[PDB]
């Protein structure tokens, strides 16, 4: 056969395993037949071009559908009253009741209401008409085309890059810091000053107007005179109606701090100043490394030079330059870990400090965004650790890493793993024990016997930032502090106004329930890290299979000898962490959603009192809030939430289906499929047809993967339904 | 011929024709010597 053209070992398989494994190994270029390093890098380059094109097409489709089937123009008038519609529904399975139930957007056809916040995002950017969105979609289609053409072109013989080019670290770092990050954020500041702020003040400025419209009455004279403070004079009044000229100012760069009163989002002038500042900082940072001139550093020199003379790190960072440059898996792990941290940061900061107008009052949108980015964060972290393990299996050279930090990590992996295990057990034992103690006492009717620990440390941090709710008087809660006096005339007025009003999510008040759920989160993070770190460090070998690097990253097992060696691979560690990552992100999002739901209804006391025992979560969060969702459709009718109820049950179904692949293993199914093949061959009128691929059971690793995928899809879809439907049915 | 007809013209295509043709061609490709 020639389906897995990249593997004859699969092309010669006489079973369906060939098809399955050709699917699942299509992108492991390194393992493909006759794969050279130049071909590997060039294929990755072209694939990156294709991926960028796909992203551009996806965003273009979003814009096009909001422009065509959307209510953006009638949403920019009363954004706090009109629900934003994502796209129209055309399903030939809908009944008249369903069509009517989904015509909620005042559009006269069934629609979906967007939960992505693109409406608020674009309105803040400066989009006002549907023609603006359509032009954006046209440009993004053009950009997808350009990047597809670039990907095709750079696979041509005279345009294929070389490895001396792919491994050029200094020039790529300089260009990515200076141009991709720095000048890109500078251009975003330019957009925010030339379009977004005038649009937020009711002055339309576009391609036909931006070359004659001054972003500031003084023009660029304050810039080219050193009188930069003239760009902060006359900010927008507190009575500014976003999108209109009533209450607007003339400042383009400010550091007011806090939130705009009407929009309850950060000041656009503050955002513009932020982007300009980080742009110049990144431009400076992108001039650090040596390129075709004499100025700059060399990362190899720095890494080799950094060795503490005490010798507590050994050879320090010698050889890491070659290790990282020659291992794409090391780079992949670093990038994935950093992007995961940054997307968790995006979730956290985007709720505590909303940047888009009126997004804070879109409760379902905020919850959906937070859950989305937290789940993405967890996936990225799991992937980073998985690719670290893959690097250890494939790209690690001990002789090159003779007694540097990496070899030392491997040296004391036992200490690392054992202490990680101890801290996991510590956290788990005691957090679960406190929860059970509270459960039992409250059950016996003695809630006064609960162990409720005030999160005084986090409360102290809040007070240091300027929260006066808790009486600490530390740094910014103190009016006579040097920290207060230093920033009293820049941002502290607005920042204090934001922190000390209970109308926002900035530094929400916390209590013993928050303490307990935080330590549950600590347990989850530590146990996921335990599984992943153990997998990575034992990937090359353990005492059970001391030659694991020979077998690779994702082999099924080593047989029933030596006591049994099920799940003895680093892939299995990934497979096992993914359960735990899902658990932990579930805990995180449960906490976020319940706290915010209680605050939104104003009964924060419900969380403060029921968060201390697990029955409180099971009753006052899940059972209580599932009512509208499970009533999406019922014997007495249906509403728009029927889709979310159906998807809730869908997630339950696929979750339980994954249980099948995770509990039932291969031999049973193989001995059953044998009987099935016998029956087919022996049945008249159906033995006229024969399989071209011998029907076999699924492999061990394949079954683990399929069960994990079903489990994950059920997890995600069940919670997505619950969160969106409950938020939309409660508010 | 207005844009309002495009959903009814396309959804059956993208959801029954494109998948059917893709599945048939991929079947022929995967089982082929």
């Amino acid at each position: 056969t020639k389906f897995p053209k990249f593997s004859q070992a699969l092309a010669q398989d006489p079973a369906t395993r060939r098809i399955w494994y050709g699917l699942a190994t299509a992108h492991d270029f390194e393992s493909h037949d006759g794969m050279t390093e130049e071909n590997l890098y060039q294929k990755i380059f072209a694939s990156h071009f294709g991926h960028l094109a796909i992203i551009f097409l996806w965003t273009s489709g979003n814009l096009f559908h909001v422009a065509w089937q959307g209510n953006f123009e009638q949403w920019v008038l009363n954004p706090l009253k009109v629900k934003p519609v994502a796209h129209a529904i055309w399903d030939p399975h809908f009944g008249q009741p369903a069509v009517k139930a989904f015509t909620k957007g005042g559009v006269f056809y069934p629609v979906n209401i967007a939960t992505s916040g693109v409406y608020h995002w674009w309105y803040t950017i400066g989009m006002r008409t549907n023609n603006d969105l359509y032009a954006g979609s046209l440009f993004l289609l053009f950009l997808s085309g350009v990047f597809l053409f670039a990907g095709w072109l750079h696979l041509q013989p005279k345009f294929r890059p070389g490895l001396s080019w792919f491994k050029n670290n200094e020039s790529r770092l300089n260009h990515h810091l200076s141009g991709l990050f720095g000048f890109s954020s500078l251009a975003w500041a330019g957009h925010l000053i030339h379009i977004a702020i005038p649009e937020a003040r009711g002055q339309h400025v576009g391609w036909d107007n931006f070359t004659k419209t001054l972003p500031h009455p003084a023009g660029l004279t304050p810039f080219f005179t050193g009188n930069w403070s003239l760009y902060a004079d006359n900010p927008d009044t507190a009575n500014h109606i976003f999108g209109t000229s009533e209450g607007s100012g003339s400042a383009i760069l400010t550091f007011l701090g806090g939130f705009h009163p009407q929009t309850q989002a950060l000041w656009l002038t503050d955002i513009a100043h932020h982007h300009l500042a980080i742009g110049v900082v990144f431009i400076f940072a992108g001039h650090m490394y040596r390129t075709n001139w004499g100025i700059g550093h060399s990362l190899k020199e720095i890494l080799d030079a950094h060795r503490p003379p005490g010798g507590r790190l050994g050879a320090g960072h010698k050889g890491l330059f070659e290790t990282i440059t020659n291992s794409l898996h090391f780079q992949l792990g670093l990038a994935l870990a950093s992007i995961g941290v940054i997307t968790s940061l995006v979730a956290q900061h985007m709720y505590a400090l909303p940047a888009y107008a009126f997004i804070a009052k879109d409760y379902t949108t905020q919850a959906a965004l937070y859950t989305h980015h937290q789940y993405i964060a967890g996936f990225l972290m799991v992937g980073a650790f998985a690719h670290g393990a893959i690097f250890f299996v494939r790209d690690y050279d001990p002789e090159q890493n003779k007694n540097n930090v990496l070899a030392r990590m491997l040296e004391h992996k036992e200490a690392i793993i054992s202490h990680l295990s101890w801290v996991s057990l510590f956290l788990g034992f005691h957090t679960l024990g406190l929860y059970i103690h509270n459960d039992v006492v409250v059950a016996f009717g003695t809630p006064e016997k609960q162990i409720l620990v005030e999160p005084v440390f986090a409360q102290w941090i809040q007070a240091s930032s300027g929260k006066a709710l808790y009486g600490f008087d530390v740094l910014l809660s103190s009016s006579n502090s040097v920290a207060t006096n230093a920033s009293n005339n820049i941002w502290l007025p607005g920042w204090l106004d934001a922190i000390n009003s209970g109308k926002n999510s900035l530094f929400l008040p916390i209590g013993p329930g928050d303490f307990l759920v935080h330590h549950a989160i600590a347990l989850g993070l530590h146990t996921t890290a335990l599984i992943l770190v153990k997998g990575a460090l034992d990937a090359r070998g353990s005492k059970l299979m001391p030659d694991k690097k020979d077998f690779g990253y994702s082999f099924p097992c080593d047989g029933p000898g030596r006591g049994g060696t099920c799940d003895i691979s680093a892939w299995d560690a990934f497979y096992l962490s993914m359960f735990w990552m899902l658990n932990t992100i579930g805990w995180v999002t449960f906490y976020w959603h319940w706290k915010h739901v209680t605050i939104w209804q104003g009964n924060a006391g419900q969380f403060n009192e029921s968060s201390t025992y697990i029955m409180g979560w099971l009753r006052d969060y899940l059972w209580l809030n599932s009512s509208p969702l499970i009533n999406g459709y019922n014997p007495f009718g249906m509403n728009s939430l029927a889709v979310w109820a159906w998807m809730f049950l869908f997630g339950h179904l696929i979750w339980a289906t994954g249980f099948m692949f995770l509990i039932s293993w291969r031999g049973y199914w193989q001995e059953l499929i044998e009987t099935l093949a016998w029956a087919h061959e022996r049945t008249p009128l159906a033995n006229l047809v024969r399989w071209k691929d011998k029907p076999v059971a699924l492999s061990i690793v394949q079954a683990r993967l399929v069960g994990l995928i079903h489990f994950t899809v059920g997890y995600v879809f069940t919670y997505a339904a619950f969160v969106i439907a409950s938020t939309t049915g409660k508010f | 011929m207005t844009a309002a007809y495009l959903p009814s013209i396309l959804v059956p295509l993208i959801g029954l024709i494109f998948p059917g043709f893709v599945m048939g061609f991929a079947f022929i490709y995967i089982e082929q010597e």
């Binding site: 094109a53 549907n130 023609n131 979609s137 289609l141 990907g151 | -």
Partner: peptide, 30 residues
């Protein structure tokens, strides 16, 4: 508000991008 001519220009750009995507897919499959 979005006219059929506009939707048609969008479709033409989509078709060009599809052609380029097929080209890139071929070049990658090699």
């Amino acid at each position: 508000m979005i006219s059929d001519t506009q939707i048609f220009v969008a479709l033409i750009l989509a078709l060009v991008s599809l052609v380029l995507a097929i080209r890139l897919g071929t070049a990658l499959y090699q």
